[PDB]
Amino acid sequence: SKVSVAPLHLESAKEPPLNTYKPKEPFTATIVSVESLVGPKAPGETCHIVIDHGGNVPYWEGQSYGVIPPGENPKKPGAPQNVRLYSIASTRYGDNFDGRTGSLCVRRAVYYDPETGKEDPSKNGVCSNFLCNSKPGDKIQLTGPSGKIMLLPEEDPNATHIMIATGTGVAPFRGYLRRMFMEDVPNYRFGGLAWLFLGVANSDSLLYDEEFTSYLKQYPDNFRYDKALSREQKNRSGGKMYVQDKIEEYSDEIFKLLDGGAHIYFCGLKGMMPGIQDTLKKVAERRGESWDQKLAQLKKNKQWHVEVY
Ligand SMILES: Cc1cc2c(cc1C)N(C[C@H](O)[C@H](O)[C@H](O)COP(=O)(O)OP(=O)(O)OC[C@H]1O[C@@H](n3cnc4c(N)ncnc43)[C@H](O)[C@@H]1O)c1[nH]c(=O)[nH]c(=O)c1N2
Numbered sequence: 001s002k003v004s005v006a007p008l009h010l011e012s013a014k015e016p017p018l019n020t021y022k023p024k025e026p027f028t029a030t031i032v033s034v035e036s037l038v039g040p041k042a043p044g045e046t047c048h049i050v051i052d053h054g055g056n057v058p059y060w061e062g063q064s065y066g067v068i069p070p071g072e073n074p075k076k077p078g079a080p081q082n083v084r085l086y087s088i089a090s091t092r093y094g095d096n097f098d099g100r101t102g103s104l105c106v107r108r109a110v111y112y113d114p115e116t117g118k119e120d121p122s123k124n125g126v127c128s129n130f131l132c133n134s135k136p137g138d139k140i141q142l143t144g145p146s147g148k149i150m151l152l153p154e155e156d157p158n159a160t161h162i163m164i165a166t167g168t169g170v171a172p173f174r175g176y177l178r179r180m181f182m183e184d185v186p187n188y189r190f191g192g193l194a195w196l197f198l199g200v201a202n203s204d205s206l207l208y209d210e211e212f213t214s215y216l217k218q219y220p221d222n223f224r225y226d227k228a229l230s231r232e233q234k235n236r237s238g239g240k241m242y243v244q245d246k247i248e249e250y251s252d253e254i255f256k257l258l259d260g261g262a263h264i265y266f267c268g269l270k271g272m273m274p275g276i277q278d279t280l281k282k283v284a285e286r287r288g289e290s291w292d293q294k295l296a297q298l299k300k301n302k303q304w305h306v307e308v309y
Pocket of ligand 1: 254308
């Protein structure tokens with residue numbers, strides 16, 4: 001039941017592509033589709049953007065594309081807008097299984113006055129709205145790809161990968177998990193444990209939930225999946241349910257896996273991290289361990305992978 005992907009020559013490169021296109025001469029890609037990923041109770045829109053790069057801007061899982069939105073740089077007259085980076089949410093083959101498209105998972109940044117709720121177009125996020133407002137056939141200026149922090153370590157096809165996402169931080173993990181489970185990639189046959197933790201505001205804010213739930217039924221011995229819905233759930237202590245609280249529910253299993261060599265990944269808004277560090281410190285203390293010591297070892301061993309923004 002693994003899906004045929006082409007072209008398999010995408011497996012031949014020994015190093016990830018980097019900076020293939022640069023801001024002064026971007027690649028003009030074409031939008032294939034834009035769809036909302038969220039339901040009516042979600043506090044804001046997050047969109048799935050499919051982009052046809054024609055095979056001209058290949059990438060590895062875990063990398064980012066740059067997008068240059070239209071208009072003048074407000075801080076520099078006559079100059080283009082600055083690049084905004086977006087974690088690629090697709091595998092190298094992309095959602096059409098053909099090596100021609102890549103996908104982004106984009107939260108629409110909308111401004112509301114803190115007192116009156118009143119909006120103001122001039123204070124909306126430029127690139128996120130540009131992307132979420134795009135339609136089939138629209139052109140986008142693409143740069144990159146870039147980034148190496150979130151490349152998937154494939155040396156051990158039976159490794160353990162613990163994936164901690166909030167919101168759009170699910171993006172690299174969608175790509176990892178399709179490569180691990182969905183696509184027929186003969187040179188990478190994953191037989192380890194992939195464990196996805198996802199924190200979002202509510203049920204309607206879930207991203208790609210049907211895809212992840214399907215892996216539980218297809219690969220029950222290789223995939224685990226836990227969700228934290230913060231506005232709809234409460235933690236053991238009674239402060240909104242964050243993803244850290246879900247990690248703590250599996251404290252012993254997770255620490256054992258880390259001690260056994262598991263990779264652990266964090267992606268999403270940088271505000272997710274302080275709570276996670278606090279929980280891990282408390283879990284370590286309860287076990288009689290120093291989290292500082294443990295984290296230093298995880299970093300030295302190249303087990304700790306963070307890309308937050
Ligand atoms: C490695 C990496 C990977 C990613 C990302 C970053 C990095 C470093 N990001 C973030 C992304 O690059 C980008 O920063 C956001 O999409 C916001 O960009 P905009 O162009 O929409 O906002 P823009 O840069 O135009 O504005 C920034 C913020 O300022 C606000 N603002 C503007 N003017 C204001 C004013 N006068 N008063 C008050 N507020 C004002 C806007 O509302 C917005 O919230 C991301 N994002 C994402 O959604 N998905 C992803 O997968 C990723 N991945």
